[PDB]
Design a protein around this ligand. Sequence first.
Ligand SMILES: Nc1nc2c(ncn2[C@H]2C[C@H](O)[C@@H](COP(=O)(O)OP(=O)(O)OP(=O)(O)O)O2)c(=O)[nH]1
Ligand SMILES: Nc1nc2c(ncn2[C@H]2C[C@H](O)[C@@H](COP(=O)(O)OP(=O)(O)OP(=O)(O)O)O2)c(=O)[nH]1
Ligand SMILES: Nc1nc2c(ncn2[C@H]2C[C@H](O)[C@@H](COP(=O)(O)OP(=O)(O)OP(=O)(O)O)O2)c(=O)[nH]1
Ligand SMILES: Nc1nc2c(ncn2[C@H]2C[C@H](O)[C@@H](COP(=O)(O)OP(=O)(O)OP(=O)(O)O)O2)c(=O)[nH]1
Lengths: 479, 483, 481, 481
Amino acid sequence: TMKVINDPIHGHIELHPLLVRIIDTPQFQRLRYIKQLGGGYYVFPGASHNRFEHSLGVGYLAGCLVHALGEKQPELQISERDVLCVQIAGLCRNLGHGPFSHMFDGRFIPLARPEVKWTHEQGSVMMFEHLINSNGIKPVMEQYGLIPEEDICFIKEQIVGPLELWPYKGRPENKSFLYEIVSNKRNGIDVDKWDYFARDCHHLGIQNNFDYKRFIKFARVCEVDNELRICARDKEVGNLYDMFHTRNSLHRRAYQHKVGNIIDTMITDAFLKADDYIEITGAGGKKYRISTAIDDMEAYTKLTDNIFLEILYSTDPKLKDAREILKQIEYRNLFKYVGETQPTGQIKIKREDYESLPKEVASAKPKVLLDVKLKAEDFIVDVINMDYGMQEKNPIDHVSFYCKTAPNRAIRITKNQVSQLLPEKFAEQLIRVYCKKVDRKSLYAARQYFVQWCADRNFTKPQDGDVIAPLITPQKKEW
Amino acid sequence: DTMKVINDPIHGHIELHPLLVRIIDTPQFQRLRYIKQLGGGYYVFPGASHNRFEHSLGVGYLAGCLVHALGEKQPELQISERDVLCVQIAGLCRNLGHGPFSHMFDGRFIPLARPEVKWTHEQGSVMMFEHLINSNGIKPVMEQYGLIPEEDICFIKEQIVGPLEDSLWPYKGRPENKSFLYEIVSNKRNGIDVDKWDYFARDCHHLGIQNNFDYKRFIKFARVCEVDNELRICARDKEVGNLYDMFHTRNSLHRRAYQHKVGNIIDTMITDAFLKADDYIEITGAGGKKYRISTAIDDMEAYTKLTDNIFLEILYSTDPKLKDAREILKQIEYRNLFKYVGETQPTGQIKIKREDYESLPKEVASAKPKVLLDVKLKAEDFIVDVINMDYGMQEKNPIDHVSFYCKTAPNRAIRITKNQVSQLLPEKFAEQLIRVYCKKVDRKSLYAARQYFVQWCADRNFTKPQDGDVIAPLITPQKKEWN
Amino acid sequence: DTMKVINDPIHGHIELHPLLVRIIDTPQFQRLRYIKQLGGGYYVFPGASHNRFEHSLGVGYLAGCLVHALGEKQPELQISERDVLCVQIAGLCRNLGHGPFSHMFDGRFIPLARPEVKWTHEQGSVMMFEHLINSNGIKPVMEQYGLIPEEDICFIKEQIVGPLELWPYKGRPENKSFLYEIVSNKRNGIDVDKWDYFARDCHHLGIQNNFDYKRFIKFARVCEVDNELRICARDKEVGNLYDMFHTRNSLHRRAYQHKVGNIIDTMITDAFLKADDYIEITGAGGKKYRISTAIDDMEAYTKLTDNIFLEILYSTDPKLKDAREILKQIEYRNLFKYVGETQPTGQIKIKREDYESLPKEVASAKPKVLLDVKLKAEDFIVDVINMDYGMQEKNPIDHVSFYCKTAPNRAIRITKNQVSQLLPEKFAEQLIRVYCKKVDRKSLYAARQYFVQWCADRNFTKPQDGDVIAPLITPQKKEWN
Amino acid sequence: DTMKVINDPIHGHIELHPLLVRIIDTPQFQRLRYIKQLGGGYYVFPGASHNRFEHSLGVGYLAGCLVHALGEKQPELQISERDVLCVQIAGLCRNLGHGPFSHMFDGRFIPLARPEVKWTHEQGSVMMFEHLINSNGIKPVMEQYGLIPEEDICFIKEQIVGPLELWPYKGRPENKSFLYEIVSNKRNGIDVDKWDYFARDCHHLGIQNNFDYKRFIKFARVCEVDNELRICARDKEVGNLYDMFHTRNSLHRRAYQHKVGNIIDTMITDAFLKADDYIEITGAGGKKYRISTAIDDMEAYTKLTDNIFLEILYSTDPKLKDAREILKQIEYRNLFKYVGETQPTGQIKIKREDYESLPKEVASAKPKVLLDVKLKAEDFIVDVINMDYGMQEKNPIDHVSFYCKTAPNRAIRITKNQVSQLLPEKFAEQLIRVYCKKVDRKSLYAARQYFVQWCADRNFTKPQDGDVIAPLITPQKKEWN
Ligand SMILES: Nc1nc2c(ncn2[C@H]2C[C@H](O)[C@@H](COP(=O)(O)OP(=O)(O)OP(=O)(O)O)O2)c(=O)[nH]1
Ligand SMILES: Nc1nc2c(ncn2[C@H]2C[C@H](O)[C@@H](COP(=O)(O)OP(=O)(O)OP(=O)(O)O)O2)c(=O)[nH]1
Ligand SMILES: Nc1nc2c(ncn2[C@H]2C[C@H](O)[C@@H](COP(=O)(O)OP(=O)(O)OP(=O)(O)O)O2)c(=O)[nH]1
Ligand SMILES: Nc1nc2c(ncn2[C@H]2C[C@H](O)[C@@H](COP(=O)(O)OP(=O)(O)OP(=O)(O)O)O2)c(=O)[nH]1
C-alpha cells in the first residue's frame, strides 16, 4: 500500500506503491550520495542536502499539479495512469547527476572529455532505463495499469524532450499540457525549480520569494494554437517575473558564489588529476574511469561524491597531486579572489576563448612598480552566463494567460503591460578573476594586472577598483 | 524601575530600558494598538490584523541593534548610552503620527477633507511626541537617565522629520561626527532604514508572503566611514546586490499587498464614509473644545483619541445624520464594493500629477467607444486611482546615494554605479499605475464602464489593459500596436 | 457567484465555496474581525493582534480538509458534498457567539454581571447562526447548492452545541456519527478548532507549536466502535495525541493564563461592570440593551465587540468616569499587583460558588509578622484557574479509538501504561493567583504576608518564591521546610 | 586574520573569531562534514541530511551567546575574552570524537567490536582535540590571542569530559565554576549542545521544536550556591525547563529511536562487524588500522567517517561480500521486519549483559497455535532502549537552581509539587523492540506469535496491536483481557 514520508519542505508526502518500488533501487538511492549544491556546502554549511530528497519533492509537486488540473477540469480526461507517469518522471529527472551535481556536467566532463557532448538529462534517461531493466519494473507497471511501451517513452520524453507535426510519441496533442509539468522546454517554468527554490532556501538560510501553491491554484489548461497548454491567471504575471528574479538571486548569492565556484574549480582539478588512476567496475567486471563511467550505467551507479573522499584518504603516490589539492581545501588554503567585472555594451565572450583569458590577464602591463611578476598559470578566470533560462529571451513572452472574465480564452501579456521597472535585458556575463599565489605582494600584483586588463578591454570598473588599484583607475576616462 | 523583556514574533525577546518603557506606557503611544498597519489591507489579507504599536516596538529594537553593533565594532566612534537611547526613542516614536487606517488617513482622507492644509504622518509624529513628553512629565525622567532634553529632543525630532529648517550640516541635535546616527531610523539620503526592515518582516509574517531581505546580515556588514567630512554608515561593496533586492522586495509588497486593487477600493470607501461623517463625529480636545475627524490633527489631545474606532463608531451609529456614512460601511460588510474596471499605465516618459487627479473621472466619462450601449455613465460614477511605484526617491536610483567600503580598505568609502552591478536591473526607477472603478455595480453598467475605460486608454496611448481583448473586444482592434 | 481563494498565513491558500462566501459576507460574520482571539493577552504579547474572524476561516478550512480526507480514503463512508459543506459551515460558525475579548466575556464578565443567567459562547454561536441565516436569506442559497435547510441547520447547530434535547442527534444518523467529531468533539476534545488555534496562536504569540495536525489527518480513519462509526487514530500516533494535550496545557500556562494577561482581563471586566448601566446598544425594534443584556438580542449582540473598550476610554460622560479611569490605569500600566500563585494539595479543588469568599479568607489570615498596613477583602483579587486535559479528572486518550496497520478498519483501545510511564498521573489541577489593588510598596509587602499565611492556613503549596517574599511565614510550616 | 561570518539556517549570521577559524580549518574538524548527525535516521527522515560539522558550529556559537550574556549582565563575574574564547572552543569541539553515523558508532558498534573498552564520543573528542592542536600548530596562535595553553587546554578538555582526574577542576577556580555549566552540564544536562540539536534536528526532520533557548539565556544569572558560583534560571521558567526535557523525550521517541532508523543502524553495524577484518585505514607512520581500532590512533580516526559505508557498498573484494550484501539489502529496502514493541512491567529493568540471551528467549517461547515455520534464535533481533530525562531515575529539575525577581541574587530550589501535578511521576523507562530476519509472510506471522507469547511469558506489557497480530495468544493472559 501507500507510504507516507515526512519532508521538511512539503510535510507528509504520500507515495504510491509503484513509486516506492522505483525509489528502493540502487540506481535511485545513489542520489543520497550526491549533494544538491556541490561545493556550496563548503560555503553554506546548511546546504548538506542531497539530490535524493530533492527528487522526492519534485515527484511530489509533479503529482500535485497534475492532480489539481484534473480536479478542476475533468474534461481533460487525465487518468491515474497519467498521474503516475508524471510523478515517475518528476522523481527521475535528477537520476543523471554526477558527483557534486552541476560541477560534474558543468565543469568536469567538459574538460575531461571535450569531444563528447553530455548532459545530466541524457544521463537521467539512461539511468532510468538501467533502473527499469535491472529491477524488473515493467511487470509492476502493468500490475498498476501502465502500458510500458507508451509510458516509458512518455516518461523519457518528459525528462529529455522529443527523442526526435507533434513530435512526441508518449502522449498525443490533447495531452500536450502534461509535458509542461516536469521539465518545461518552452519557458522553464516547472516543478523542479519550485522544489529547489524552497529546499535550497530552507537549507541555505536565505528566504524564498516564490509561492508555487498559489501558482497551482491559478493554473488552468486552455487551447493555445491547437494545443492544450497550461495557462496562468493574468494577475500571476508579476509573480512569474519575480520567480525568475528569485532564480537569478539564488544564482548570484549561492549557486555562483565566488568561493563556492573556486572550490568547485579546485575539486574539478583534483578529479582531472585523479582520472587516470581511479578505476570503477562496470558491467561484466570491465573498468572505467571517472570520465568514462558515464558510458556504462552499472559503473555510473557507483560514482558519487564518494570519489572526493576516496581521493582524500588515498595513500597511492599516483594520486599525490590530486590528494594534495583536496588537502589544501581542508586547510582552507584556497586560490584568492581578485575581483569581478563584466563586458561592456555589446560584448560577449565565447566558450572557445575561455582558455586564452588567464594569458590575457598575465599579459597586462600596469604602469606601477611590482616586486613580483605573475604568470598565466597563477590566474583563474571564471566566466559565468547569467540569464532567465532562455539565453537572450524573456521566458514570460513564452507563457500563456487567461482572465477571470473568459477562462477558456488564452492570452499573451507583454512586458510593457506589466512594469517599466522590469529588466530591459535577460542575459549577462560575469567574469571572476582569482590568483593561485596567496602572499601579500603577489596578491597586490594580481590586483594591478586585473584592473589593467579590465581597462585594456573596456570591461566594467571593478567595484573596489579605486581602492585596490588607485594608480590604474584614473587612466581610464570612462571610470 | 528596571528593564523589561517583551516577546515579539518577528524579533524574539526584546529588552527595553526603563525610560523606553515609560514612554511606551502613555495614552499617546498605546493609541497605536488601535491603528492597523495596513488599513484596508486586512479586508483582503485576513492575517494582516497587526497594528502600528507592535511595528513601533520593532523599529525601536532594530534601531538599537544597529547603533549597538556599530559601537561594538568601532569604539572610536564614541557612541554613548545617551546616543543609543535617543535613537531607540526616535525608532519607537516615528509612527506616532499615524491616523486611522494608517496611510489612508494622510494619503486619501485629509487631502480631500482639508485640501488647503499640508499634513503628513511624519509631522504628526513630531507633534505627538512633543505632546507625549509634555503630558506625561517625561523631560525630568530623561535627565534622570542622563539625557539632555534641549539637545536630545531636538535630535529625536530631527531623526523623524529631518532638519527642522543653506549649509553643509543642517542638524542641531548632533554634530557631523555623529552623522551616521541620522541614517538609522529615518534615512532621508536613500531610505535604507530600520523602519523598512521591520515592516518587511512583520507584514510578510502576517500577510503570508515571504520576505527576501535579510536585515541582520546588513547590520553585520555595516561600518562607519568618513564621507565629505561626515562619518556615515557604509555597506560592504559585495552587498550592493542585496540592496537592489531590498527595493525590489519593497516594490513586490506594494504590488501584491499595499496597493492591492480591492484593498485600495476599500480604503476609498472608508475615506468616503469619513467624509460623510466628518460634520457629525465629535472629538474632545484641549479645554473640552470639540474637533472633527478632519480637524483633530490640529490638537494632539484630540488626535490621541482618533483611531480605527471611528470606523466602528460610524458603523454602529443609529443617528440618522450618520445614515449615509453608515450605509457605505454596511456595503463594505456585505462586500458590495465599487467595481474594478481595469488598470493601465502611461507609456514611456508620461506622468500624471497630483493636481490632475480630479479631472480624470470626467475624462473617462467623455471617451466615446464606438459600441452600442444599454446605459450611459457619468463622471461621478467613476473612480480613478493613480498609483506611484518607485524606489522611494521618485525617478532617482537610491543606490547612487549609498556609500560602500571594501574588505581591503575598510575605512575608505566608495561609490558603486548600476553598470558596475548588473544589466538585469531596472533601467527606470519610477512608474505609474492607473486603476479605474465604477460605483454602479450592475452588469450593464460594468460592461459600459469597460468600454469607456479601454477607449480612454487607446485615445491616450496608455498601455493595453491585460484583459483588454476580453472585456472590450470591439475597442482593442482600433489600436494597432495592441492588435 | 463563484468560489474565492483567500490567503492565510497559517494555511496558505484556502478555497471558499460560494455558499461559504455568502455566510462570511454578513454583518454577523464580519463582526468577528473586531474580537481579539486572546483578549487582554495582546496587552502582554504584542504579536497577538489576531481576531476571531481569521481563526474561524481557519477552522472552517481544517474541518473541510478532515472530512475530504476521510471521504477520499474510505468512499464506503458515503460522505457527500452536502456533508462537506455542512461541516465547513459549522467550522466557520462555531466562534460566532464570542463576545468582546473572547473568553473574558463569557468567562468573567457575564458570570459577574448576570449571575442568574447561564450563558456560553456556544449557545451564542447557535443564536447568531440562526440570526445570520434569517437576516440574510441564506436558506434559499443552501438549497441551491443541494443542502436540505431543516435537517442541515439542525446538523450545523448540533455540531456546535451538541444534542438539542441511544442516538441523541437529529441532523445526521449513527452511520455518520464521525462527522460530529470534526468541529467540536464532545467525546475527547480532539477537533479542528484546537488545531487552528495552536498553529495560529503560536504564529502570533511567537512561541512554538509541537502538534502536527496534518500528520494526524493523514493517519485518521473511520472505524466501528460500540455500533458507532468514529474517527480513529493510528495506534503509533498515541504519543502524538498525548503531546497535543501537553501542548494545550503549555499554551494555557505560558499565554492564555498569563498572570498579567489575566489581571488585564480582570481590569477590563471591572470597567465593563462600571460602564454597563450607561452604555446602550440598539437591538431589534429599536429596543435598547446593555453590554450584559445584548446577549438576549442578536441584532444588538451583532454590534457588541472590542469597540466597547474604546467607547468607554474615549467617553466624556461623567457617568462613565469610573469605568474610563480603570482603562486609563491600564494605559499607564498602573495595574493591580500580582502577589503570587499557589495550588491546592487536596482533591475536589474549589467550587465556583466559593470564589466570592476567597478574598475575605486572605484578608482574615493572621500572619505573625510586623505590618504597618491592614488590608481588607476588597483589596484582594483571587483568580482560580482550572487546568486540565479537557475532561476534568479524565484522561481524554482513554476516550480515543485506534487502529493498527495489519487491520485498518478494526478499532482498538490503548491504555496509558501501554504508552509510557513518563506521562501524567493526574489530568486536572487548579492554580490560584492572588493580586492586590493597592500598589504601594508597603501594601504589596503586606499582601505577600497575608497570602503566604493563607496558603499555610489552607495547606496549599508553598509559593515558589515563598521563602523570599515571606521569610517569617514559611518556616512555621514543616511540610514546606 | 580577521573575523569571519558564516550563514547558518538555524542561527543566522555567526561571527567567528580568527582563532576559532584556525581550529575549524583543519582535517580533524572538517572531518565532521562527513558524519551524519542522525546516522541511520536519514534513511527514514530524508530531511536529516545534516552533519556533525554544522551542529558543532552552532554549539560553539550558543556557548558564546551564553557566556557573553552572563558577562554583560554581571560584570562582577570578571568574565574575560580569554574565558569567552575557551568556552567557544569547547563548544565547537565537543563533537570531534563522533564516529561514522554518530551514535551508532559509540552506541552500537564499539560496544560489540570492543566490549572490553570503555569509550565515549566525549573521550574521543578530547583525544582528537589534542591531535588537532598538536598537528596544526594551534598553541602559538592561542598565545597570540592571549590564551594560556597549559591552563586553557586543560579548561577546554575539562568542559568536554569533566575533571581529567574538593574543587576537582584545574583549568579554572571555584569563582569561575559556572563556566563548566555551558558546554556539557554534568549537574543536570542543561547545556548549549541540546539547544542546537533541538532546533537543528527539528528544522531538518520537519518536526516542531518547543524549547526557546534564547529566552533561557535572557533569564540566566549567576548566583552563589553552596559556595559555588552557578548558573541560575528565573523561577517562572521552571515550566519551560520541564518542557525542554519533554521535547527531548519526544525527539527520541519520534526520531532518534524510530523503529526503522534503529534497525537500519543495526544492519549497518553488522556490516561493519563483518567488514572489520578486511577494511584498512591508514594511520600514523603508514600503519594500518581497522574500523574497531581507528579509535586508538587519531590520525586514522581522522579518516574514519560515513565514507566506510560506501567503501563497503562499492567494494569488489569477495571477503567483503557478506558485509556488502547487508548494505545492498538496505538499498533494496529488504530490511529486517519490525515485529513489535513492549515494555517491562513495574519494577523490571533489563540488564546489559542479558541483551544477547534475549533472542534465544523469544525463540524458546511456545505459542499454542498452528505454524508453517519454526524460527530460531538467530532469526530474531531484540533492541533494548533506555529512555530517560538524562539522569536515569532522577529528576533533573531537582538539580537546578532558581532565582526570583524580588531577590535576584538569592538562589532557591523548586520541587516538582510546587510546579504542576500534571508532570511525569517517573523519569526513566525501557522500550523493547523485536525484529525478524526472515521477511516472508509465513515467517512474519510466526514471529508475531513468538513475540506476543514471549511478552506474556515475561509479563511485559501487551503490544498495542496484540489482539490483531496474535488474536489466539492474547486471550491466555488475563491482565490483558
Ligand atoms: N512529523 C513527524 N514525522 C514523523 C513522526 N514519526 C515518524 N515520522 C516521519 C518519519 C518518516 O519520514 C515518515 C513516516 O514514518 P512512520 O513511522 O509513519 O512510517 P513507518 O514505515 O515507520 O510506519 P508503518 O509502521 O510502516 O506504518 O514520517 C512524528 O511523530 N512526527
Ligand atoms: N516565548 C515565550 N514568551 C513568553 C513566555 N511567557 C511569557 N512570554 C512573553 C510575554 C511577554 O511579551 C514577555 C515577558 O513575559 P514575562 O511573563 O516574562 O514577563 P512578566 O512582566 O510577566 O514577568 P515579571 O514577573 O515581571 O518578570 O515574554 C514563554 O514561555 N515563552
Ligand atoms: N501569497 C500571495 N497572496 C496574494 C497575492 N496577491 C493577493 N494575495 C492574497 C490576497 C487574498 O487573501 C487572496 C486573493 O487575492 P487575489 O488578489 O488573488 O483575488 P481577488 O479576488 O483580488 O482577484 P480576482 O477576483 O481573482 O480578480 O490572495 C500574492 O501575490 N501572493
Ligand atoms: N543570507 C545570505 N547569506 C549569504 C549571502 N551571500 C553569502 N552568504 C553566506 C555564505 C556564507 O555562509 C556566509 C559568508 O559569505 P560571504 O560571501 O560574506 O563570505 P566571503 O568569505 O565570500 O566574503 P569575503 O569577500 O571574504 O568578505 O554568508 C546572501 O546574500 N545572503
